[PDB]
Amino acid sequence: VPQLDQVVPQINVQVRIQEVNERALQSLGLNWRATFGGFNVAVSGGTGL
Amino acid sequence: AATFNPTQSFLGFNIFPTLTALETQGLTRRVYDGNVTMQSGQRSLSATG
Known about the structure:
The structure is cut from a larger assembly and holds two copies of chain A. Chain A is mainly beta. Chain A has strands at residues 32-36, 39-43. The A-B interface holds A 47-49 and B 19-23. The PDB classes it as membrane protein. Keywords: Type II Secretion System, membrane protein, Cell envelope.
């Protein structure tokens, strides 16, 4: 009995959960259309020449 | 796909060309680095809800 009735420790546990997220985007595009004699040229990003 | 018409006759030569060209590139990366701290004879946990 004296051993099963002793004081046991009391504790405080701290847990920290961190989460950080970062993003970065960069677009750039030229999209033209030239018309000289007889010719018709169109340059884009989706379709090419 | 060539045809001939013996009843009519075009004037001169016409060529009516059309060009198309496309190029593309891509590159996807995805990386993970995970740590876990544990013990030697560690057992699983049965919570599972």
